[PDB]
């Protein structure tokens, strides 16, 4: 099947690293394929780490259930009420721009949950992972764009990606494996 489209975020990051440099359609496909592959690798390994070592965590769920156990009936009813009012008021009362990211911290989240990588997802995991995808994207586009200017073109083509990633030891190791 098909994976998600990061194309617009690759484009924003591109416009920050090399603003007047364009990108072709195929090259954008390559970049999106990279961002996806790294998302599945980091999300996969992080998922293995999560399922392997599990830590005990108190959440509103266990507090609510404990309250329903300990308190008698009408008490427990109104206490569950006030608790839920308090947490929803705590919630309802920008995420990427908060972290200062072009990448969609909100979308990385709904994906980490969609992918069934874990039963729960923390916060700052989409911030960390979105920041990492944004950084890797930024490096690849900076090198490939420099390759676009030294080959004297106005846009990035898939060849420029091959040049930039092959002639960088670390990026070649990363995107070769």
């Amino acid at each position: 099947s098909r994976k998600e489209s990061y194309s617009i975020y690759v484009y924003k990051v591109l416009k920050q690293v090399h603003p007047d440099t364009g990108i072709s359609s195929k090259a954008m496909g390559i970049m999106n394929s990279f961002v996806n592959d790294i998302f599945e690798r980091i999300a996969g390994e992080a998922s293995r780490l999560a399922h392997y070592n599990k830590r005990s965590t108190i959440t509103s769920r266990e507090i609510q259930t404990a309250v329903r156990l300990l308190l008698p009936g009408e008490l427990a009813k109104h206490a569950v009420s006030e608790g839920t009012k308090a947490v929803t008021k705590y919630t309802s009362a920008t995420r990427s721009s908060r972290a200062g990211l072009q990448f969609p911290v909100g979308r990385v989240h709904r994906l980490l949950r969609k992918g069934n990588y874990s039963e729960r997802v923390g916060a700052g995991a989409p911030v960390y992972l979105a920041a990492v995808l944004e950084y890797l994207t930024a490096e690849i586009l900076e090198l490939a764009g420099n390759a676009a200017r030294d080959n004297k073109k106005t846009r990035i083509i898939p060849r420029h990606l091959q040049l930039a990633i092959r002639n960088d030891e670390e990026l070649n190791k990363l995107l070769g494996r």
Binding site: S7, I8, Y11, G22, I23, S24, S25, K26, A27, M28, R155, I157
Partner: peptide
């Protein structure tokens, strides 16, 4: 190989 541009 057309150039990429944002869309709606």
């Amino acid at each position: 190989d057309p150039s990429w541009h944002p869309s709606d």
